[PDB]
Design a protein around this ligand. Structure first.
Ligand SMILES: [Mg+2]
Ligand SMILES: [Mg+2]
Ligand SMILES: [Mg+2]
Ligand SMILES: [Mg+2]
Ligand SMILES: [Mg+2]
Ligand SMILES: [Mg+2]
Ligand SMILES: [Mg+2]
Ligand SMILES: [Mg+2]
Ligand SMILES: [Mg+2]
Ligand SMILES: [Mg+2]
Ligand SMILES: [Mg+2]
Ligand SMILES: [Mg+2]
Ligand SMILES: [Mg+2]
Ligand SMILES: [Mg+2]
Ligand SMILES: [Mg+2]
Ligand SMILES: [Mg+2]
Ligand SMILES: [Mg+2]
Ligand SMILES: [Mg+2]
Ligand SMILES: [Mg+2]
Ligand SMILES: [Mg+2]
Ligand SMILES: [Mg+2]
Ligand SMILES: [Mg+2]
Ligand SMILES: [Mg+2]
Ligand SMILES: [Mg+2]
Ligand SMILES: [Mg+2]
Ligand SMILES: [Mg+2]
Ligand SMILES: [Mg+2]
Ligand SMILES: [Mg+2]
Ligand SMILES: [Mg+2]
Ligand SMILES: [Mg+2]
Ligand SMILES: [Mg+2]
Ligand SMILES: [Mg+2]
Ligand SMILES: [Mg+2]
Ligand SMILES: [Mg+2]
Ligand SMILES: [Mg+2]
Ligand SMILES: [Mg+2]
Ligand SMILES: [Mg+2]
Ligand SMILES: [Mg+2]
Ligand SMILES: [Mg+2]
Ligand SMILES: [Mg+2]
Ligand SMILES: [Zn+2]
Lengths: 155, 144, 129, 81, 150, 87
RNA sequence: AGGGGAUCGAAGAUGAUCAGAUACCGUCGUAGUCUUAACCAUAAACUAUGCCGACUAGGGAUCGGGUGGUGUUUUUUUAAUGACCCACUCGGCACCUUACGAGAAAUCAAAGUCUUUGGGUUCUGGGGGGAGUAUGGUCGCAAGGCUGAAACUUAAAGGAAUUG
RNA sequence: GCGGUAAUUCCAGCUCCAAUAGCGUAUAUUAAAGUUGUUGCAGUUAAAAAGCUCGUAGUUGAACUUUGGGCCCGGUUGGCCGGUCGGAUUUCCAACGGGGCCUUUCCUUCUGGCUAACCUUGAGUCCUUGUGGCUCUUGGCGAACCAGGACUUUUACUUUGAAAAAAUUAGAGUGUUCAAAGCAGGCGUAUUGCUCGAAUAUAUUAGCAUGGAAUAAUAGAAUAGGACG
RNA sequence: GGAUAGUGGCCUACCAUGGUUUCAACGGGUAACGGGGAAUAAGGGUUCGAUUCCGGAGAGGGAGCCUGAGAAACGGCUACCA
């Protein structure tokens, strides 16, 4: 989520060991590192064009993506730089030979390279433990908004 | 179709609904309340051993006429006080007050036998030996 | 309101038979109804039928003989796993020697024997004898 | 009964049925061309009106609405198509 | 059928097989579409138009002689109203019914009807809302509705 | 209803309704077999020589015996008019 | 809580009746009975029969709508009307006869299309008594409403039809 | 249900039954029980439809969009021969299935690598009068999949498969004297060894991998903020 | 940042206001260790598993710790309670 200020903490936000020599007069001020997480996920330009710092970003930060790759729909965006998705699924009861609707809510970190709204289907990649509960990271937005601009005024 | 949802996802309704109506089953409710362990003289166990308080003379129910010869027993593990039947001709001669006896069920899932009213148990042994053997002659009652 | 459109068609057919009749106008037809009516016809239980064309959902006239005892629908299309098909026909077919459970697989609406011969499975539709 | 033709039923029994239970449903209303010889031209009118239809030039009348078919007004003619 | 009553009335236009034609219909697309918009401009409802165009003129169905439902022709010419027509006529009813209930607190049956009317409103809205014709967050409110219809 | 090697097993293959082709089973003591006689050149009813039809008790029970008879005979050649396939 | 309080009339008092007669029958008559403002939320609130959809069988009446007619009656100058009549067609409240079918039966055009058992969905029951009792929760000014057990007891309670 | 004086139920004697190195009893549970009912219950009168309607969660929800037709390839059972020294394969034939084509038909897509395949043909020919047959390089198939870039509406179902403890369970082999078992054992030159075993199946719900495209969902282009260049 | 073998509200500062729930959160009960499995045989089920194998937990109850590669060990120590 981040937005504005970027240098808004008590500590200086920077990328580890990405020294920029001040002697060397340069036109871009800050040298910035990045990668592609692989598995086929484009490292969106807003990660390379970005100036945010998030060490928990899978493109600009020091996290690796491995283990389960999951999709689920976004249902909470109130946590600064993280969200809560719901993954629905039917569950088979034998004896009755039918299923029942179930769900779980997975908490997952979301880098300022994505701009996620409630309702967006999102794909996340499993993580090293990143917080008390978050074990996933938003790796791609599948959605958009859900035709919001096609909710405008009158003729 | 009457009642029961036929749907392909209605499993949850279908289970819950059952859960609910199992309670109308006398054995399922008994099991889960633990009526066995809670109420009921015996611990839940099959027999239990107590001490003889008074020799009684229960008069049978109609259309029977009899005096039915029983013992009030105080269950050892329990203190709970219970009246028990002493079967076969005599045998009330075998017991005596303050003697130990091994009570057992009557084979009716709780519930009294026939014309004996109130009695839900029967005597099986006294002073560690067995009414049955005593009744015959295969064994003898212990010292004191 | 109208639930399984296959249900009404099947039912109407059965009552036309039971009343000793030789035709049913059925409504409102559907891909699935034809493909079902199609499998009966393939095996003798009805005659020829006819799609009439109101510019709506359709009507079908079925001509039937009397070879047919019952043709029901399985109201929730349960899944069937190549082995459970044994257990289905066993439950609702009068003998091992004839009669068909018709169902729906990835490779088309087909009776259980063509289903067994092609070695595919899927969901369960209805049945014929 | 027991055996008949559902496909090609008699014109008359089909005729008497409800407009929704015919073999393929259709209307049973019609349109007409109406005159009131003060004028020379002819408005096209639907057999069922709701709107009390007025003629081209003169505020005259034509028909009044009813429960079904409109009551045409006094001195008028009509063909059907 | 019949949502808010135990009525079982079947009753509807029985549309013709003839998806085109009438053949004896002269005029033209041009002819009628203009006729639509002029009436839409008088403030007529697409329904009112169809009816008016049905009897007086020979417009068997507007969608035929022009492959286009009357409402879409209106939208296309900018004549579409804020909220849909049926939605409108429901609200307008609940406003008259309410006005009556203010004036007659003793009428329990009005109270009962209002519920019904409003239930239908509230449900209809949510359909329209779902399919984006009404802004997500639209809402019929008793207070505000009277200013809404008029 | 054959067997392992050919061999007609299981007795009594029953009759059948000419109207409905349902089985005409034994205790159906309400069904009927109608023998319509073959005629020759100028009257003359040719004893023992019929066109026959069998109608299940059910069918006569339902009253459909006289209509279904008509259809059968007519479209078999011994009526012309009387019946109409359409209604 | 105001009003109203003709009538009939819980309660009460009586006259008779009775072995008794706190009753039935008669008299007096408080509350009530009506109304406004507010509560209460229960009736054998019953069709003791959930709603939506389909299919399966005959008949005559009737209620509302409609359509058809060189129908009757209304006179005037024919109509126009209206009322009536006859055939159909939707949707009503019902009755009749059958019953392919269903049921333990009485009976049932649904209580049918069910061991040839699956259109969709809601709710309730699981022997009898204990008992709609105890308890907690909750609603109510109250009376009471909703939710609502167990111990213990018991071999039947019950339904429909038959003969007495 | 028997017993209140001829007790077919008690207490015995005799005789008789059932199971028998075992048989009774008490408690629990399972079958019977379609008396918990998904399969599969019952609710007019037997226990049971909420006084009534509205209504959210929940479950459920009409029809309609590549169908039809033509061509090739190669299988596995079965027949009628058997050619052959019990099983064999070609032609004849049906039958049931898998693959790929062309019918206006994305197969994600470009940039080579690769080619197995004929529109080829370059010669002609073993041999039945020849399209019966495969070797065979010099113009002319993509997809069979490598790998790099650039992107991809979501699901449910079902298929085959991988990964997978043993003992238990099902079950093959083996004569523990039989058997419950066990996993041994079997053959000779029984003086100097020979040898078969120690299978298979189930292993589901979830996860992974692959084939399918019916049934059932989902998203798409209407203030064009559309689609291809 | 500190701590740890190391991720992590694990702990601490600062900052924010979030996380779960009728698809049953939270709470209560269990005469609850979980599995491999056991009992019952048309099928669907119903009941059971302290107990020969795998996992986990404990050593009268709690806490703490020394040694050590490995223990918060108990046929090790220290303390409190019994
Ligand atoms: Mg926050
Ligand atoms: Mg109860
Ligand atoms: Mg006492
Ligand atoms: Mg103790
Ligand atoms: Mg409704
Ligand atoms: Mg209707
Ligand atoms: Mg209408
Ligand atoms: Mg008064
Ligand atoms: Mg009195
Ligand atoms: Mg007196
Ligand atoms: Mg009194
Ligand atoms: Mg009540
Ligand atoms: Mg009544
Ligand atoms: Mg009728
Ligand atoms: Mg008329
Ligand atoms: Mg008795
Ligand atoms: Mg004697
Ligand atoms: Mg004797
Ligand atoms: Mg004896
Ligand atoms: Mg035994
Ligand atoms: Mg099932
Ligand atoms: Mg029952
Ligand atoms: Mg009752
Ligand atoms: Mg009711
Ligand atoms: Mg559908
Ligand atoms: Mg598998
Ligand atoms: Mg093995
Ligand atoms: Mg932190
Ligand atoms: Mg807070
Ligand atoms: Mg619950
Ligand atoms: Mg425990
Ligand atoms: Mg265990
Ligand atoms: Mg357990
Ligand atoms: Mg224990
Ligand atoms: Mg330990
Ligand atoms: Mg100890
Ligand atoms: Mg503590
Ligand atoms: Mg320790
Ligand atoms: Mg020790
Ligand atoms: Mg130790
Ligand atoms: Zn005019």
């Amino acid at each position: 989520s981040t937005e504005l200020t970027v240098q808004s903490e008590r500590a200086f936000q920077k990328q580890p060991h990405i020294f920029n020599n001040p002697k060397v007069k340069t036109s871009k001020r800050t040298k910035r590192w990045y990668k592609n997480a692989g598995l086929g996920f484009k490292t969106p330009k807003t990660a390379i064009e970005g100036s945010y710092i998030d060490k928990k970003c899978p493109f600009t930060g020091l996290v690796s993506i491995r283990g389960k790759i999951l999709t689920g729909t976004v249902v909470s965006t109130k946590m600064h730089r993280t969200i809560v998705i719901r993954r629905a699924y039917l569950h088979y009861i034998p004896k009755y030979n039918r299923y029942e609707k179930r769900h779980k809510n997975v908490p997952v970190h979301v880098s300022p390279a994505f701009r996620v709204q409630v309702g967006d289907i999102v794909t996340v990649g499993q993580c090293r433990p990143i917080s008390k509960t978050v074990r996933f990271n938003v790796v791609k937005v599948s959605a958009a908004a859900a035709k919001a601009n096609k909710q405008f005024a009158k003729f | 179709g009457k009642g029961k949802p036929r749907g392909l996802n209605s499993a949850r309704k279908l289970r819950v609904h059952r859960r609910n109506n199992r309670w109308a089953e006398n054995n399922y409710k008994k099991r889960l309340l633990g009526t066995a362990f809670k109420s009921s003289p015996f611990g839940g166990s099959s027999h239990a051993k107590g001490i003889v308080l008074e020799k009684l003379g229960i008069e049978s129910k109609q259309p029977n006429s009899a005096i039915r010869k029983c013992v009030r027993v105080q269950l050892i593990k329990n203190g709970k006080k219970v009246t028990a039947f002493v079967p076969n001709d005599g045998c009330l001669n075998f017991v005596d007050e303050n003697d130990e006896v091994l009570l057992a069920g009557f084979g009716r899932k709780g519930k009294a036998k026939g014309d004996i009213p109130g009695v839900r148990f029967k005597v099986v042994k006294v002073s560690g030996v067995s009414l049955l053997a005593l009744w015959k002659e295969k064994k003898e009652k212990p010292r004191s | 309101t109208r639930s399984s459109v296959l249900a009404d068609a099947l039912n109407a057919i059965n009552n036309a038979e039971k009343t000793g009749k030789r035709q049913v106008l059925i409504r409102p037809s559907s891909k699935v109804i034809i493909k079902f009516l199609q499998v009966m016809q393939k095996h003798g239980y009805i005659g020829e039928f006819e799609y009439i064309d109101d510019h709506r959902s359709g009507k079908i006239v079925v001509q039937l003989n009397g070879r047919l005892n019952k043709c029901g629908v399985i109201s929730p299309r349960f899944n069937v796993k190549i082995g459970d098909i044994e257990k289905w026909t066993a439950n609702l077919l009068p003998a091992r020697q004839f009669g068909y459970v018709i169902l729906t697989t990835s490779a088309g609406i087909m009776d259980h024997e063509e289903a067994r011969r092609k070695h595919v499975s899927g969901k369960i539709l209805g049945f014929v004898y | 009964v027991l055996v008949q033709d559902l496909l090609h039923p008699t014109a008359a029994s089909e005729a008497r049925k409800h407009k929704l239970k015919t073999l393929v449903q259709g209307p049973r209303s019609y349109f007409l061309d109406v005159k009131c010889p003060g004028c020379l031209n002819i408005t096209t009118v639907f057999s069922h009106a709701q709107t009390a239809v007025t003629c081209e030039s003169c505020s005259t009348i034509l028909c009044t609405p009813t429960g079904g078919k409109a009551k045409l007004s006094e001195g008028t003619s009509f063909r059907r198509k | 059928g019949r949502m808010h009553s135990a009525g079982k009335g079947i009753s509807s236009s029985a549309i013709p097989y003839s998806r085109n034609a009438p053949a004896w219909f002269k005029l033209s697309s041009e002819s009628v579409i203009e006729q639509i918009v002029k009436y839409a401009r008088k403030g007529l409802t697409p329904s009112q138009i169809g009816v008016l165009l049905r009897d007086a003129h020979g417009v068997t169905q507007a969608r035929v002689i022009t492959g286009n439902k009357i409402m879409r022709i209106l939208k296309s010419n900018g004549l579409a109203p804020e909220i849909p027509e049926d939605l409108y006529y429901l609200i307008k009813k609940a406003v008259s019914v309410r006005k009556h209930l203010e004036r007659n607190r003793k009428d329990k049956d009005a109270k009962f009807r209002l519920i019904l009317i409003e239930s239908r409103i509230h449900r209809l809205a949510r359909y329209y809302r779902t399919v984006a014709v009404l802004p997500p967050n639209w809402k019929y409110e008793s207070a505000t509705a009277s200013a809404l219809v008029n | 209803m054959e067997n392992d090697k050919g061999q007609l097993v299981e007795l009594y293959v029953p009759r059948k309704c000419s109207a409905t082709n349902r089985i005409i089973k034994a205790d159906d003591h309400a069904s009927v077999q109608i023998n319509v006689a073959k005629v020759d050149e100028e009257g003359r009813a040719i004893p023992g020589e019929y066109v026959t039809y069998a109608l299940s008790g059910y069918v006569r029970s339902r009253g459909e015996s006289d209509d279904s008879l008509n259809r059968l005979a007519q479209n078999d050649g011994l009526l012309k008019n009387v019946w109409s396939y359409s209604r």
